[PDB]
Structure formats: C-alpha cells, structure tokens
C-alpha cells in the first residue's frame, strides 16, 4: 500500500506532584504529530498551539458550561482517576530477582522484574565500592508493569575478595545483597 | 508522589483504525477493544479492583474520526510523514538452557501506527504462545510497541523479529542466539 | 472504582 495516511491524536494528561496535592491537567489535540490546541489548567482556557487550532480555541471557549467543566477537571477527572487505581499503580511494589554471573573479565549483576522503576544498585569489593568501570544498560521497561536492569563492573576475576551486589528498591525496607 | 496519567486516543485514515488507552508512568492500565467493544486490562488483576465503561471510549473514537476529516481539510490535505521504527530484541530474564524465558521485541519511535511483526525461529514463522501490546504513546507523540515470544532456550534454535513499516524500504530483522 | 473518560470534543467547522 502506498496511499497517504492521516492521523489525529488526543491526549488527556494528568500530572501529579506529591500525590494529589498538586495536579495539572492538559487536554491536548494533535494532527499527525503536531499539537494544535491545548487546555492547560494553569492557563484556564483553551489556547491554540499553532494556527491550525485557532478555530477550535475560539469555538470551545465560547461553549456554555465548557470552562467550568474543564477548570474542574483536576478534581473531577485527574484526582478521581488517581484514586481508582492507586492501590495497584501508585502503591504497586514488586521485589526484584538478582542474579550475578560473569561474561571472564566482565562481571554482571542482573536485576529483573521489579516495580516501580526507581532503583539503586551498587557494587562492593570487600566492603569497598568500586566506582570506575561500572557500566549499566540503564533502566528498561519490560512493558508488562515490571522493570529490569543490568549493571556490570569490569574487574579482575580472582579467587580473593568477595563481590556483593547491593540493590535498593521501594519494595524493600532493607537493602538486598547477592554475594559472589 | 510524582506520577503522570494519560488517556491516549488516535484515529488513522484511510485505514479507519482507532485505539483508546490509559497510560500510568509509561505502562498500559487498559485499552478498549474497538471490535468487541470490551475493556481489556493489561494485567488481569486490574479488572478486579477497577472498572471502565467501554461505551465512552467508542464515543470518543467516533469524535476523533470526524475531527480527523475536519483537520485534514484544515491542513489542505497534508499527509503524515513516515518515521521508521527502532527495533530491539531482549529477554526478561538471564538465559539458561531448558529454563522457560520470554523474548521481547520492542518497537520504538515510529509513526504511523501500522506494523507487521513476525517471530522467526530458524527462519520460519512462529505464532505459538506469542502476544503483543497495543500502540503505546510517546512524549514526542510517536509510538512504541511490545511483542512477546515465550520460548525454551537451546543452543540449536535462533530467533529473529521481523518488523515491517512504511518508513522502512525492506523488512527489519533483529537476531538473538545462545 | 470506576474510571471516568474525558470526553472528546467536536472540532469547529
């Protein structure tokens, strides 16, 4: 197929700071990949991002009951939806599985299947944290509401000092350590 | 404390295709199956603590379909510009022989949201056990997608992920062995 | 708990 395509997108965004204490709402319309009209709860009215959306901003702002409906969205829409899924989204905690193996000048600590994404992984060498030659794949999103990451330390593999990988996660009250 | 919830909708022409989803910090809470008019939760457990009337999503897609025709006229019929995807293949666990694992083909930074994805084991297509996600939003308003193939690791089998897009001149294959 | 959709608005003509 070679015929042209035309895409329209709408994104209703809710931004939460310290939970629901501070919320910002955004009603966003996109033609192709270009925002043309937007309602920002900080602005209080629909504003045109590009001239393509200037017809809608004048129309929508004039409709009866519109601004009252949209100026209240942070309470009626954003804050409400936060609480509907709070127990399995904001409060979701999944402890990770940590595996340590080599790859053998290269030694890897593989942290898999955790939620949320916030994690801190450090590498210890006989109680000494080597801060050089530490490479991480970064945080990758598995797409199934779990995360994983690989953090490696390129170190001389010798039968002497004990190597412990330490991870810190909001699911655990105490750090988790795996020893090699 | 800091979170972001996004209700993301789109309609595509001339394919006449639309999707409706909720995103929480980058993960899908649920999407609405336009065909069956059903709410599909990304994790089965989600459907036991929350609910959503799909009827409202179908209404929202019908408005996006009409608005698209209006916006297409506003732009004097300027079409979308294709953007090829970035494909990455990986597993969700360290690979051990004869221990079940899942391959993850991650397709990222592409538009329009139309892709052909096939799992190839030793060059031959495989669909037993495979699954995929809907098109997921992106801050730059392109799309991302996940495909999964559960498999039993072996030294005999190799795998590819063949992705077909309109920004690609030829199919794209991403390999994996061991 | 029931999720609430933000309704899509019809564009000007």
């Amino acid at each position: 197929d070679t015929r042209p395509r035309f895409l329209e997108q709408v994104k209703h965004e809710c931004h939460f700071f310290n939970g629901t204490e501070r919320v910002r709402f955004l009603d966003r319309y996109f033609y192709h990949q270009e925002e043309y009209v937007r309602f920002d709860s900080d602005v209080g009215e629909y504003r045109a991002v590009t001239e393509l959306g200037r017809p809608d901003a004048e129309y929508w702002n004039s409709q009866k009951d519109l601004l009252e409906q949209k100026r209240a969205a942070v309470d009626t829409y954003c804050r409400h939806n936060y609480g509907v899924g709070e127990s399995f989204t904001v409060q979701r905690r999944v402890y990770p599985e940590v595996t340590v193996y080599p790859a053998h000048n290269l030694l890897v600590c593989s942290v898999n299947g955790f939620y949320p994404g916030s994690i801190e992984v450090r590498w210890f060498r006989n109680g000494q944290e080597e801060k050089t030659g530490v490479v991480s794949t970064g945080l990758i999103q598995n797409g199934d509401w779990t995360f994983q990451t690989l953090v490696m330390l390129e170190t001389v593999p010798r039968s002497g000092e004990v190597y412990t990988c330490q991870v810190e996660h909001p699911s655990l009250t105490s750090p988790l350590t795996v020893e090699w | 404390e800091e979170h972001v919830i996004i209700q993301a909708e789109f309609y595509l022409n001339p394919d006449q295709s639309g999707e409706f989803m909720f995103d929480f910090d980058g993960d899908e809470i649920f999407h609405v199956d336009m065909a069956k008019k059903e709410t599909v939760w990304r994790l089965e457990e989600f459907g036991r603590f929350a609910s959503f009337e799909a009827q409202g999503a179908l209404a929202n897609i019908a408005v996006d379909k009409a608005n698209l025709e209006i916006m297409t006229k506003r732009s004097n019929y300027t079409p979308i510009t294709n953007v090829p995807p970035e494909v990455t293949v990986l597993t969700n666990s360290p690979v051990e022989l004869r221990e079940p694992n899942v391959l993850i083909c991650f397709i990222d930074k592409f538009t329009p949201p139309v892709v052909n994805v096939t799992w190839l084991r030793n060059g031959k297509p495989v669909t037993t056990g495979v699954s995929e996600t809907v098109f997921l939003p992106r801050e730059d308003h392109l799309f991302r997608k996940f495909h999964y193939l559960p498999f039993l690791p072996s030294t005999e089998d190799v795998y590819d992920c063949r992705v077909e897009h309109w920004g690609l001149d030829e199919p794209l294959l991403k390999h994996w062995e061991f | 708990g029931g999720y609430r959709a933000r309704p899509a608005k019809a564009a000007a003509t």
């Epitope: 009866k64 409906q69 | 409202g56 209404a59 408005v63 009409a66 | 609430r4």
Partner: T-cell receptor, first 112, second 112 residues
Framework: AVFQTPNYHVTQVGNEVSFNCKQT?????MYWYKQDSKKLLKIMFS???????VNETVPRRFSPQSSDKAHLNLRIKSVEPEDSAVYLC????????????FGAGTRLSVLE | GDSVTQTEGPVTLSEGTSLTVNCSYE??????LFWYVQYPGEGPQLLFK?????EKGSNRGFEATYNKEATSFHLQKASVQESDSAVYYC???????????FGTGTRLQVLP
C-alpha cells in the same frame, strides 16, 4: 437556546409524525425525552456528534436523525394512541455528566 | 438499576411556608445529583446540581444537601413564594457518563 417544531400536532393512529430540534449552545450531545400525563420524564434517544449513544425506545418504531450536531430530528413511523405525550428535546456540552438544556416541548395527540 | 423516588402527589402551600420535597436515590455508581424545575408553559430547567458526595446546592432560595450516607437529596426552602409554583424533578446521573434518571416530579402550588 433549544427550539423544537412543531409546538402542537394531532393525527390519526397509523400516521407518520416528524419532530425537529435545533440548539445554538454549541453542544455536541442532544436528547429526546418523553413526558407523560403523570410527569414521568424518561429518555428515548441520545446523539453525540451525529452518532447514536443511548437508545431506550422499542426496537424499530422510531427513526431519529441528526444531519448536524446542532440538529436532532425524531420520526414516528406509525403512531399508536400511547404515543400521545409531550416530547422534549435537550442538549448537553458533551456525552459526560452535564446539565441538560431543554426545549419548550412538542405536544402530540394521537387519535383513533 | 439507578432509581429516584420523590414526594408523591401534588403539594399545595400558602406562601411563606417552609418547603421540603423528599428525594431518595439508589445507585451502584458514584453519581452527581440534580434538581430540575419546570415552570408553567416552559420546559425543564436546572435548579442546581451537586457533583460532590457530601456538598450543598442552592438556588432561588432552594437548598438540598447530597447525603450519601442516607442516599437523599431532599429539597428545602424556608419561605415559598407564589412564583415557585412549578414541577420539581430530582435526578441523578452517574459521574462517568450522562445517563440522567428523573424522578416522578412533584407539582408545587403556592397559594397567596
């Protein structure tokens, strides 16, 4: 506002009737309601941007029509004596929870 | 099964009399509540609405609190005027979609 025609109409059982409604509020959603002698106000049809949303009427006796989001027309193919009522047209900003804005009503009398 | 139950039959009061129109609702979803008024010769018209579970609505000297514990929305006014003669409709609608259920509608007649 919300305008309906006709204001009154009388016809015989088995005839066809056509009501029409326009709203100038800019709203995407319009409604037809039936109001009876005992002040029962129940919904018949709901349209959002020329698409059917709600239908609580009997399977095939009625024929609503919306060429535009500002117009909502109702058509009874064959009237029964039980169709004698006041028919009110309403609008709302969109299909979510909203205030309803009504018209003056159409008073329809169906006689044998 | 959303349902609304209002005061039965017509109410007749001398002007200056307090007023109470009892309204009980029943729903498995979280609703917003409304009071509509229908003056003679006109269509229905919003009196006030209360979206939040335990809040108060007021207009034209009328007042009703959305009692979620009792599932009630009783309308009250301390001194009704002759201009208040009309039909009053209590209604609810779920907060995820406009699906308004109206009560039976109580006609109020204020006598001078």
């Amino acid at each position: 506002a919300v305008f309906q025609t006709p204001n009154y109409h009388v016809t015989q059982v088995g005839n066809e009737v056509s009501f029409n409604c326009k709203q100038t509020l800019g709203h995407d959603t319009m409604y037809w309601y039936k109001q009876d002698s005992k002040k029962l106000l129940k919904i018949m049809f709901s349209y959002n941007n020329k698409q059917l949303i709600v239908n609580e009427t009997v399977p095939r006796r009625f024929s609503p029509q919306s060429s535009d989001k500002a117009h909502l027309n109702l058509r009874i193919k064959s009237v029964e004596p039980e169709d004698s009522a006041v028919y009110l047209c309403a609008s709302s900003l969109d299909w979510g929870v909203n205030t309803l804005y009504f018209g003056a009503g159409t008073r329809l009398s169906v006689l044998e | 099964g959303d349902s609304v139950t209002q005061t039965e039959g017509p109410v007749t009061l001398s002007e200056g009399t307090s007023l109470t129109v009892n309204c009980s609702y029943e729903t498995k979803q979280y609703p917003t509540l409304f009071w509509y008024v229908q003056y003679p010769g006109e269509g229905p018209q919003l009196l006030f609405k209360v979206p939040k579970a335990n809040e108060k609505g007021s207009n034209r000297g009328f007042e009703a609190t959305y009692n979620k514990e009792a599932t009630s929305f009783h309308l009250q006014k301390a001194s009704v005027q002759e201009s208040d003669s009309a039909v009053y409709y209590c209604a609810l609608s779920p907060s995820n979609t406009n699906k308004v259920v109206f009560g039976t509608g109580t006609r109020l007649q204020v006598l001078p």
